[PDB]
Amino acid sequence: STGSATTTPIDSLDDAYITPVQIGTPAQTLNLDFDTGSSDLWVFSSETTASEVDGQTIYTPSKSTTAKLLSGATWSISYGDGSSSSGDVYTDTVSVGGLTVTGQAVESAKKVSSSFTEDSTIDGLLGLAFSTLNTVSPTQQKTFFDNAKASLDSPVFTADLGYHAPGTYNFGFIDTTAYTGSITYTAVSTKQGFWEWTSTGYAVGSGTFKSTSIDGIADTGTTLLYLPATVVSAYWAQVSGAKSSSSVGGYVFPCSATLPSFTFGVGSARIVIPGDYIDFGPISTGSSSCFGGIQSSAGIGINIFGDVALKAAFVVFNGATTPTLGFASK
């Protein structure tokens, strides 16, 4: 089997992408944030505290003839941005882009943190990291991809995120028309539960490539590119007037600037992020200070190849017995 679904930016900045997901019988379609940095499929629901729902579409398990309470199971997750959610668990039929999994754990939120409530466009998350990170207790549950894997034509999914435009998540096949050149594959460590890999270096604009190993994660659920402070300083030094602002929370730059590209290495291959992809717009409405799309990871503990990086590539998440990542230009 295969599946193919369009993923759509939630706003004009590409802050996140939403993909429609069918849950239950008859289907209830929710728009979920596909997150290769986490491993829970959780949804706003009829159980979510009413004051914490503000415009999201909810899953109502009592209206699904295939929903079953997973007795005793609870979940609770905290994300790298400080947000969180928790609740109980149902199993139900879940379909993405025509690919159906029966008995998928659907984690129903009883509580969500304010950042979720305040974002009416995201109805929940669909985790695509390794199932070892799934938070369901006392019986850990599998991700949608893990449940689907054995049925897929090939045990892979691909992320093709758009710049200011829709893109595609495919399951079970690699669309050879969706990229240019060849796909370069690189080793993955699953030791932390992530799609963790090592970039071979970087360049700023037309500058020379610096060969240096940068360990990080491919994370579709993170907006920006978070890299070591040395790398980030080298980038922003090429933008007149750019500076790190402790009060804003990162590098800002004059909105009048033209940003240079940023290149990262995948083996001997190179992925070029155009400068425009690094512009996240005014820090507040009407400001002439703009927020940068490349930021320091120094306070995180891990480097993160988020959407800024991934949307410059066609990305293969190869879930074979020994997982690997593939990157192609497009």
Tokens describing residue 242:
């750019």
C-alpha dihedral sign at 202, 168, 134, 119: positive
| Ramachandran assignment for 312, one of left (phi > 0), alpha (psi -120 to 50 degrees), beta (any other) | alpha
Alpha-carbon 241 to chain mean position = 30
Write the residues followed by a gap in the chain (C–N more than 2.5 A).
Answer: none
Task: Please state, in angstroms and rounded to a whole number, the distance separating the CA atoms of residues 210 and 176.
Answer: 30
Alpha-carbon 145 to chain mean position = 14
Cβ neighbours of residue 51 closer than 8 Å, sequence gap 6 or more = none
Q: Are 53 and 44 in contact (CB under 8 A)?
A: yes
Task: Please state, in angstroms and rounded to a whole number, the distance separating the CA atoms of residues 83 and 64.
Answer: 29
Instruction: Provide the 10 A C-beta neighbour count for residue 230.
Output: 11
- 């480097």: which residue's tokens? 303
Task: Please state, in angstroms and rounded to a whole number, the distance separating the CA atoms of residues 132 and 88.
Answer: 19
- Domain made up of 175-330: CATH architecture: Beta Barrel (2.40)
* 127-148: b (≥16 Cβ within 10 Å) or e: bbbbbebbbbeeeebbbbbbbb
Alpha-carbon 223 to chain mean position = 7
For the chain, the three-class secondary structure string (H helix, E strand, C coil) is CCEEEEEEECCCCCCCEEEEEEECCCCEEEEEEEECCCCCEEECECCCCHHHCCCCCCECHHHCCCCEEEEEEEEEEECCCCCEEEEEEEEEEEEECCEEEEEEEEEEEEEECHHHHCCCCCCEEEECCCHHHCCCECCCCCCHHHHHHHHCCCCEEEEECCCCCCEEEEECCCCCCCCCCCCEEEECECCCCCCEEEEEEEEECCCCCEEEEEEEEECCCCCCEEECHHHHHHHHCCCCCCEEECCCCEEEEECCCCCCCEEEEECCEEEEECHHHHEEEECCCCCCEEEECEEECCCCCCEEECHHHHCCCEEEEECCCCCEEEEECC
CATH 2.40.70.10, the chain: domain bounds: 5-174, 175-330
Q: What is the set of active-site residues?
A: 35, 199
- 């305040």: which residue's tokens? 118
Cis peptide before 26 (omega within 30 of 0): yes
Q: Are 194 and 301 in contact (CB under 8 A)?
A: no
Task: Please state, in angstroms and rounded to a whole number, the distance separating the CA atoms of residues 7 and 172.
Answer: 17
Alpha-carbon 36 to chain mean position = 5
**Beta pairing, strands 167-171 & 3-9:** antiparallel
Instruction: Provide the 10 A C-beta neighbour count for residue 1.
Output: 14
Instruction: Provide the 10 A C-beta neighbour count for residue 84.
Output: 15
Cβ neighbours of residue 138 closer than 8 Å, sequence gap 6 or more = 72, 73
Q: Are 217 and 37 in contact (CB under 8 A)?
A: yes
Tokens describing residue 188:
């993955």
Q: What is the CA radius of gyration of the chain?
A: 20
Q: Are 129 and 145 in contact (CB under 8 A)?
A: no
- 């990542």: which residue's tokens? 325
| Ramachandran assignment for 270, one of left (phi > 0), alpha (psi -120 to 50 degrees), beta (any other) | beta
- Quickly name the fold that domain 5-174 has: Cathepsin D, subunit A; domain 1 (2.40.70)
Q: What are phi and psi for residue 150, nearest 5 degrees?
A: -65, -25
Task: Please state, in angstroms and rounded to a whole number, the distance separating the CA atoms of residues 182 and 23.
Answer: 36
Roughly how many angstroms between the first and final C-alpha of the chain, as a whole number?
25
Cβ neighbours of residue 47 closer than 8 Å, sequence gap 6 or more = 87, 88, 108, 109, 110
Alpha-carbon 247 to chain mean position = 26
**Beta pairing, strands 28-35 & 17-23:** antiparallel
Q: Are 222 and 235 in contact (CB under 8 A)?
A: no
Task: Please state, in angstroms and rounded to a whole number, the distance separating the CA atoms of residues 26 and 307.
Answer: 33
Task: Please state, in angstroms and rounded to a whole number, the distance separating the CA atoms of residues 170 and 191.
Answer: 25
Task: Please state, in angstroms and rounded to a whole number, the distance separating the CA atoms of residues 273 and 313.
Answer: 9
